[PDB]
Design a protein around this ligand. Structure first.
Ligand SMILES: O=C1[C@H](c2cccc(Cl)c2)CCN1c1cncc2ccccc12
Ligand SMILES: O=C1[C@H](c2cccc(Cl)c2)CCN1c1cncc2ccccc12
Ligand SMILES: [Cl-]
Lengths: 302, 298
């Protein structure tokens, strides 16, 4: 019993964190086999940050300009290449702690663990979701660039995020491990803003099923709804549309609890209308949207 | 910017998790040097009588895909110590520490000696933890990291009828009035960790959330009267002193923040949130707020 915002054990990712220094800039790198991955903006000063021509800045660099530090050992950079917004620093030593890994690009609503790092040293681990507006509500200070987001289903680490930037609202933007940004963001200081954020509906429903599995049923009602009427109501509370894919994905939780997805949708409609009335659901007074249907099954069943 | 419930990096603890099997029971063990620590209910009650009947080979200890050989066994309070022939090469610098209610720690939840998740939590004033544990999680540990030293503070033993959890420090002493036996046991009435709520209000101020601040201050005695009425732990002079750095950083005296908390308790949030929460969060200590809002590494 119990329901916690749970991150994956970070050990496999900790053994990959390194410090990358370029001139005055110091940030984090991910050392896998003989390559160190890091944000390409490590080659920028902060003055050439408004409109940097990364190809032009990178061609002027030599391998010895990049100082890579893995613990108290300086790694030797033997090559460099840029792939989208990530810099790939070929080093002369393969990381002996390299876990089984994959680079996966995630979709909005997906969750992952973040190993926040400063100077190549892990300081904390927390659980995140990719918001529908492609930002993450992280906890990052200056120096955290290059910190990574991941999932560890089974023994394979799936890297899905690399931190690059903080937007003016305090939210964060970054790329997959191929250097492609999530969202319409660019790695430059031009005026950028997170789009209006919406609640991840399928995740809220999964969390309502988690509460039912944990013995809480107060919010359930005798009503059902059509998928269209649910979405017409959902949109008015800035909730993401619920697709037939999401209804299908919620199938196992529906079968386990005996509450049809559209029946749980009618509970959600009622909660949106009434609020909680001094009550909580899984120790929360707000509807939680950073647990996917997959997270709920993993945590509640194994 | 941002404020998350953040756990310590679990790597140093992952290298210590093993699976302990005895009879039909399978649970987790903590392998440090040549000893595996696990709950004594794995033998299970007269635990001295049950243990004397067990031989070393009855305990099957598995570290990954390698079976460890048990060369001795002894009991210390509600913890069983299984001497093994091999010292754990991944043994970090560590200490066994007993924590106080209100202190926080990271839990590395495990099943079959394999770490499955890490979460942060606090020792409640009623000595329970609001954890997330299924059957098979016994022996999962709670810890903090101080520089490069892992301080083990908790070992999971059981789940109470309300879904909350009870366990021991690594010396086998239970937190709370609990016993490791199937009997009627209930978590006592819980209270809110006042010093932690204040630390979280300072974290919200540091993050740009000031709506709850007011011009008022209060005496410590008047605040404790209000706090007692709302099932909040008494705020001591030690807690006021501990909150000093955050008070100096934000420019809001501890008793000034106490007057914000009093108004929040009497009037509610009024549809507003603080750090994305509609409830007052009490599972961040003043040290956790300083560590996160200043980026300390391990
Ligand atoms: O946002 C940025 C900077 C930046 C600027 C423009 C484009 C890029 Cl790709 C990156 C680089 C550091 N950084 C930060 C990243 N995360 C958290 C932070 C907190 C407080 C100050 C800064 C922070
Ligand atoms: O509470 C117990 C049992 C127990 C019984 C008597 C004495 C002791 Cl010390 C412990 C052993 C397993 N266990 C659990 C431990 N944590 C979470 C759980 C969740 C769901 C079911 C069980 C759980
Ligand atoms: Cl995805």
């Amino acid at each position: 019993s119990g329901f916690r915002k749970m991150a994956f054990p970070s050990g496999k990712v900790e053994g990959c964190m390194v410090q990358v220094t370029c001139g005055t800039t110091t940030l984090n790198g991910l050392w896998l086999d003989d390559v160190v991955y890091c944000p390409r903006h490590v080659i920028c000063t902060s003055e050439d940050m408004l409109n940097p021509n990364y190809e032009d800045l990178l061609i002027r660099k030599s391998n010895h300009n990049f100082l890579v530090q893995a613990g108290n050992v300086q790694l030797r950079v033997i090559g460099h290449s840029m792939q989208n917004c990530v810099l790939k620093l070929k080093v002369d030593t393969a990381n002996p702690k390299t876990p089984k890994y994959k680079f996966v690009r995630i979709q909005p609503g997906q969750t992952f663990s973040v190993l926040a790092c400063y100077n190549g040293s892990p300081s904390g681990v927390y659980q995140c979701a990719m918001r529908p507006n492609f930002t993450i509500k992280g906890s990052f200070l200056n120096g955290s660039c290059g910190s990574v987001g991941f999932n560890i289903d089974y023994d394979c680490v799936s890297f899905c995020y690399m931190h690059h930037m903080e937007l003016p609202t305090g939210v964060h933007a970054g790329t997959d491990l191929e250097g492609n940004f999530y969202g319409p963001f660019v790695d430059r200081q031009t005026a950028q803003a997170a789009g209006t954020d919406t609640t991840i509906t399928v995740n809220v429903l999964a969390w309502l099923y988690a509460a039912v599995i944990n013995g809480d049923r107060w919010f359930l009602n005798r009503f059902t709804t059509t998928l269209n009427d649910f979405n017409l109501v959902a949109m008015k509370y800035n909730y993401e549309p619920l697709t037939q894919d999401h209804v299908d994905i919620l199938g196992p939780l529906s079968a386990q609890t005996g509450i049809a997805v559209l029946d749980m949708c009618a509970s959600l409609k009622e909660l949106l209308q009434n609020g909680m009335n001094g009550r909580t659901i899984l120790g929360s007074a707000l509807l939680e949207d950073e647990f996917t249907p997959f997270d709920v099954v993993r945590q509640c069943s194994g």
